[PDB]
Amino acid sequence: VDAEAVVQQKCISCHGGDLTGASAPAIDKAGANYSEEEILDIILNGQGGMPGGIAKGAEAEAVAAWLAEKK
Ligand code: HEC
């Protein structure tokens, strides 16, 4: 699944078009902070203001992996 397309219609909603943060902190370099597993966990189990399972399955996995690349 197109990680970027998903992000563009699930994450950026709060994280801003650019992942720079907006209504949520910057996840642009989540991959530098946390591995795909951890990012995936957060996507699945949300965190603080973030509700969980925003994306799911290959949607979530692709995003997590792609963000693992983003630093
Ligand atoms: C608004 C309802 C959000 C959407 C849509 C997504 N996220 Fe989010 N995220 C949001 C907040 C407010 C926070 C901080 C939580 C708190 O209150 O403590 C986060 C956090 C993350 C993180 C961890 C960053 C950190 O706190 O160190 C990651 C890795 C993350 N979010 C990823 C992520 C992705 C990929 C999303 C689309 C599937 C996504 N978020 C949506 C708010 C919101």
Swiss-Prot record:
The entry's keywords: Cell membrane, Electron transport, Heme, Iron, Lipoprotein, Membrane, Metal-binding, Transport
GO terms under cellular component? plasma membrane
Q: What is its main location?
A: membrane
**Keyword check for Transport:** yes
**Membrane topology of this protein:** Peripheral membrane protein
PTM field: Is a lipoprotein in vivo.
GO molecular function, a single term: iron ion binding
Cell location: Cell membrane
- Which annotated residues bind heme c? C11, C14, H15
Concerning its family, UniProt says: Belongs to the cytochrome c family.
Q: What does this protein do?
A: Natural electron acceptor for a formate dehydrogenase.
Q: What is this protein called?
A: Cytochrome c-553
List the source organism.
Sporosarcina pasteurii (Bacillus pasteurii)
Q: Which part of the full protein is shown?
A: 22 to 92 of 92
